[PDB]
Amino acid sequence: RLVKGYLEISQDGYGFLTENLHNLESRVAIVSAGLIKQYALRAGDYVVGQARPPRENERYATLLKVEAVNNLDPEAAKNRPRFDELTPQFPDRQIRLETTPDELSTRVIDLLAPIGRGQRGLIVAPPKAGKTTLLKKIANAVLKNEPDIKVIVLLIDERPEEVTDFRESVQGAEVIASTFDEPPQNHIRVAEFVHERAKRIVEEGGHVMILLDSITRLARANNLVTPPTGRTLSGGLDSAALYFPKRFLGAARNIRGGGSLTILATALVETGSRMDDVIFEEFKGTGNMELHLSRRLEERRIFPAIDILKSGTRREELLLGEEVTHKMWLLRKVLADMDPAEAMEMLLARLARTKNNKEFLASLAAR
Amino acid sequence: AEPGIDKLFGMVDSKYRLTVVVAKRAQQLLRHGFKNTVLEPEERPKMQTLEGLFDDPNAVTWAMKELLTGRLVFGENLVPEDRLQKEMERL
């Protein structure tokens, strides 16, 4: 008999193989610590191997023989540089954001806070104010412009109807979600398992896109799950709880050795809580991009309701030309003159006339 | 006067079109500065005491001297108007 699934190294050093539901189930295979050291496998590894049914007194099948790991021939898994030893880089392969159904939104996103492979940015917005729908839009645009990249989206602490709608509108792309109905322990477990799985995939020099909903709700779920941490920070925050989200987010990077890891997460902001804004602050110094959406702009039904002024990236020249960089300088001058709601109204008038390539070059003429 | 006003009138149907074209060119020259000219290399206007007409003594004459060349094209709707007319006023 044969078994297949994702490695889930528990605290006792044994593993579980999940299905499409991606939590604890029963068709799991136990991989001995000897086997783990033999193939140098870490959790989240895509293991496929011959394993007879669980023997007498045995509740889960034991992986007698491994054949395919990381979709490939297993010597690579054992003989590969460790993730931490990979040489990082700045993002250099920007992702062209040219989608027809909503040209305005993705055009603005790219022209203002361009995104490349290995980007670590944050969409930062109050709740019920445009994070999820825009995440869906950019996910579809990525699925159209970069079919090569393994695109993965995680939804945390979210409404089940949104989950269903998106998974219907994901067009089969790997959509994993965690509704608010689920206990936060499940939330943390699934998020971490996705973390190591993506880590393994990048370890195979792969480009991994992760789109996370509710990074702030993620931090809150960690704080709930994190039982002590001792010192309680300003506003009731766990100090060391963030490190698991901090490890989770800082893992995103541009690696010089092939592949990439780009993660974009939804930040809830001006929610009136010191916890939320503070956590925004710690994760702000970790990310290379912030795209702010304002409550009142969304209130005026203007979409996208981007807070243009403070949104930006680092090392634009590493994704843009000096021509592009200087045109961006000039445009940001114009917009720093130009008031936010006013900015959106007149820019939506201005830019709709030409599509992302049409707009891109006709505007490099104009802007 | 100015270089060949008869040629100017011949190459437009009605004078008010000519006036609006020359003045919009002048406004473009002012906003972008005089770098966005299309007669730069050799033939530039010149003052007497110095070479002051290189930068900006009079933009209207600059525009008219520009238009005598074939480097200027004007039309009722040659470009999506909304984009230009809503980027013009905020810089």
């Binding site: 599509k355 | 008010y16 473009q28 966005n36 074939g70 480097r71 004007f74």
Partner: peptide, 29 residues
């Protein structure tokens, strides 16, 4: 102020060629 001449877009030949190049590449492929 007459609408027939009230607004008349003005652009130089080089930016005209840039915008028209954007037009011909606007028809992709």
């Amino acid at each position: 102020g007459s609408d027939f001449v009230r607004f008349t877009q003005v652009v130089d030949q080089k930016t005209l060629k840039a915008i028209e190049e954007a037009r011909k590449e606007a028809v992709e492929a």
